[PDB]
Amino acid sequence: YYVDWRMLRDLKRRKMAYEYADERLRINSLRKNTILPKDLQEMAGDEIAALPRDSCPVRIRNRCVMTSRPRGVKRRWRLSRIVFRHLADHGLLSGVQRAIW
Amino acid sequence: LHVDVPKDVTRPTITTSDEPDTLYKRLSILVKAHDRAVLDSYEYFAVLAAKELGISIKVHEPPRKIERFTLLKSVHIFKKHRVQYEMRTLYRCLELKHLTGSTASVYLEYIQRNLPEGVAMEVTKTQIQQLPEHIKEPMW
Amino acid sequence: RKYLFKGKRLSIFADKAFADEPPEPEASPSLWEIEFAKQLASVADQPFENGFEEMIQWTKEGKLWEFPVNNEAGLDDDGSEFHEHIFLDKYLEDFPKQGPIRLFMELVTCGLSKNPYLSVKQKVEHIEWFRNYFNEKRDILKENNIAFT
Amino acid sequence: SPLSEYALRMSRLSARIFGEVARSTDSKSMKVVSLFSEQPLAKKKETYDWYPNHNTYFALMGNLRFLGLYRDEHQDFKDEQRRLKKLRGKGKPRKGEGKRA
Amino acid sequence: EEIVIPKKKTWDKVAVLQALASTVNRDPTAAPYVFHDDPYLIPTSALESRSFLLAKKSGETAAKFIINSYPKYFQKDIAEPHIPCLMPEYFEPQIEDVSEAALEERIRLRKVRASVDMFDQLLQAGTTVSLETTNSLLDLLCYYGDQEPPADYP
Amino acid sequence: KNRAARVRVAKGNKPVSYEEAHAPHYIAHRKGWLSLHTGNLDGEDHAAERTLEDVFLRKFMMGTFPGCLADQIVLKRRANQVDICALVLRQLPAHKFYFLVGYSETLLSHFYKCPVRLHLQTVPSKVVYKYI
Amino acid sequence: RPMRRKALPPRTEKMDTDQDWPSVYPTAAPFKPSAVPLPVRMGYPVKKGVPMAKEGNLELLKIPNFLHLTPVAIKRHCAALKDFCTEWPAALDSDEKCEEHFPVEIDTADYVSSGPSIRNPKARAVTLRVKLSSLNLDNHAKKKLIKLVGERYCKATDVLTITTDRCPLKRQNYDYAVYLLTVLYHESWKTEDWENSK
Ligand SMILES: [Mg+2]
């Protein structure tokens, strides 16, 4: 069991973007240039659109791995501000201390 | 042991090859840690080990780095109230000189295996070799 | 008196002028030979006597990293060479020798040469993909005055 | 200043040696070199392995609780609240037999 | 003028640890290393010595049982280089078709009764079996004397 | 008022340990860190993965030694080795501890693909820093 | 009726003051109050109190101790490790002497961190540094070599720096940097007809 249904949908989005990465790379290359005929570029613009929407990598959201919080996350640890503060304030993070200066 | 002592302890086999050895003009060892005292003890252990093996060593302290970030203290609203956290990184650089490749492997193995917890190393070997045989002679 | 190595011997056998004439692996290790070797190991099997002997055993089994640290230990990309990764124009022979397709594929092979995260086999698959793609679009290219294969 | 023939022909001689783009390429067409020289965002281990396998932990620890090798204070707490709730007659209805027919 | 470069010495991956091990000797005031270094956990008698080294082995067998019975939870590998000895073991044949190759797998896995069944089935069909493969079957049967290899399980 | 990791005053009858007595701002001043790895040092990677392993390793040790832990465990990573240092009460028989060490070591070595060792220091009872 | 086990007395009591301490702590271990024969105390003391004792001290357990590394052990260890080392050539007694016979400098970097994976992306990069004075270059070649390399050449130090990280492995990037030097040197000597129009 994952934290919630929102984390489950995101997990699937992350596994389908990995599957279609090479495909979306090879096809999208045909569009990001000025060297190929515009007829081919307009057609490659439609092959990329036909791929499933969950393959698109801009639909991935970074959520807290432990609470599935969408915002407030720190990317180095993948934890929300609330969860990070609980581990940090108890001496459980290696080298993290309070900042006094 | 007072009376019971090993007689002829078995020692590993070290076989000299026929390949020429690497020649390191310099070998910089940058250790990092959150704790200065650990760096002092590791510096003492490493400098003593180098002097005991005949290696030439010098030590300096690169400037420390402190990374600070701010967070929201409350779980809900109360924006103006924050909590700040920092991680401190301290450095000790062990600059070795004029090392063969056999001396640099045994020394690095010995000191890397004894690297305390919370300490990261960044070895920067600088090898010196002759010129390529093709480059030595211009050929058209 | 009872000299261990002075006196009469059986003499059924003769001095081994020829020694170990048949190779030790005359056949692939059988269950009988594979199991006898395991039993010889147990004869000298004693528990660890200190932390060194434990680390020695972990190293022999691959559990513990080898030292000095090598960040590329066991990491060989199919035994390739630098020239294989960098010079990739041999694979563009099927493509038109000149024209827009050549200009595009040149940019593709330039990026692939600067890609450290792909193997040569993976890089070839990217090139092969475009070869089949343009073949399928032969009719659209012909309208644009580009002839492919 | 402008690039004379000597300057331009030297620049092409350099690019040929250093494996750089040799022709005059627009800024738009230089993205193709970027796309195929950089690992895509969806192929980076941080993206596709952003989450821990929550199913493995929950299933493994649940199995260990049934083998007697792990004790889950939280689960024992919930198990007794269900037991007491069922005695009070507030238990979960059977599927298809809910209050609304 | 030409400099003479020394010839590089070489040694095994464990050679350095073996050198350091030679320096230290046994601690006379400590129990054998297997036993836990704590006054509460030090074996007082010879019975507690063997019992402590039989409860430890039992806990290792309890873990290996769980790992080999729920392998799907112990399949993610995050160790580079890859550690083969820390992966779940599989001992049951996964080749379903009845061929000389399938018999060879059972022989390799050392299953005695299953291999005999597939060998007899191969003879029933009459499919050719290599003399070398037929010998690998006899080796397993002759060595284990027609009885399944000894093992411990629930 | 700040409520984070502060064991609040009772009426002089609550036995707090050294670790519990000190609030978060005493970290790196009076009390150290329970986990020591290299993943939060500058220019180092895999902080997220080391932290997740720690969270699990603490929940695993509590359940595997239920009611037998006198204080929080200390995790020490060197190279790929993991070392768990736990203060454990002398409640269980001696032979039972040998079982849980063999089990918890093998299970966590096949789960994270590293050599894991458990270090247990047995106390007669919880050590009280002060009564608050 | 139930019997609670009694802990033995600490083994420090049986330790002589002239013992072989390296044997007590052969390798890195956590602090064991029952094995370290020292009355060490750690902890901020309460008012009218002394720092806490070693037994049951979490603070001492949280320390990365150096008991396994003592001046007596380090000297005994290095005595064994001497056979591994090889002797630096005496002739190369100066930095300038090395540049004479070994003008090419190859930089390789290793990284040691804690974790299950030994892989670091930064370990592939290689850097070659050679001085153009060390290379046999005619007046024409040196000008051609300096124009092709661009900013890789430093006029102040007269050092050409080639940084190669494009290839996946370090052995490939190293062989590539040596290759880049060979082509640049050989190309610089070659004279092209278009060069007469400078
Ligand atoms: Mg977004």
From Swiss-Prot, chain A:
The keyword Iron-sulfur does not apply. It is found in: Mitochondrion. The keyword Cell membrane does not apply. One of its GO terms (cellular component) is mitochondrion. GO terms for biological process: mitochondrial translation. It comes from the Eukaryota. One of its GO terms (molecular function) is structural constituent of ribosome. Its main location: mitochondrion. Disulfide bonds: none annotated. Keywords: Mitochondrion, Ribonucleoprotein, Ribosomal protein. Component of the mitochondrial ribosome small subunit (28S) which comprises a 12S rRNA and about 30 distinct proteins. Interacts with LIAT1. Belongs to the universal ribosomal protein uS14 family. This is Small ribosomal subunit protein uS14m. It comes from Mus musculus (Mouse). The chain holds residues 28 to 128 of 128 of the full protein.
UniProtKB/Swiss-Prot annotation, chain C:
Coiled coil: none annotated. It comes from Mus musculus (Mouse). It is found in: Mitochondrion. Belongs to the mitochondrion-specific ribosomal protein mS31 family. This is Small ribosomal subunit protein mS31. Component of the mitochondrial ribosome small subunit (28S) which comprises a 12S rRNA and about 30 distinct proteins.
From Swiss-Prot, chain D:
Keywords: Acetylation, Mitochondrion, Ribonucleoprotein, Ribosomal protein. GO terms for cellular component: mitochondrial inner membrane; mitochondrial small ribosomal subunit; mitochondrion. Residues 94-101 have a biased composition (Basic and acidic residues). The keyword Mitochondrion applies. GO terms for biological process: mitochondrial translation. Residues 80-101 are annotated as: Disordered. The modification N-acetylserine is found at residue 1. Signal peptide: none annotated. Residues 83-93 have a biased composition (Basic residues). Its main location: mitochondrion. It comes from the Eukaryota. It is found in: Mitochondrion. Component of the mitochondrial ribosome small subunit (28S) which comprises a 12S rRNA and about 30 distinct proteins. Belongs to the mitochondrion-specific ribosomal protein mS33 family. This is Small ribosomal subunit protein mS33. The lineage of its organism: Eukaryota, Metazoa, Chordata, Craniata, Vertebrata.
Curated annotation (Swiss-Prot), chain E:
It is found in: Mitochondrion. The modification N6-acetyllysine is found at residue 72. PPR repeats lie at residues 95-129, 130-154. Mitochondrial RNA-binding protein that has a role in mitochondrial translation. Component of the mitochondrial ribosome small subunit (28S) which comprises a 12S rRNA and about 30 distinct proteins. Associated with the 12S mitochondrial rRNA (12S mt-rRNA). Belongs to the mitochondrion-specific ribosomal protein mS39 family. This is Small ribosomal subunit protein mS39. It comes from Mus musculus (Mouse). The lineage of its organism: Eukaryota, Metazoa, Chordata, Craniata, Vertebrata.
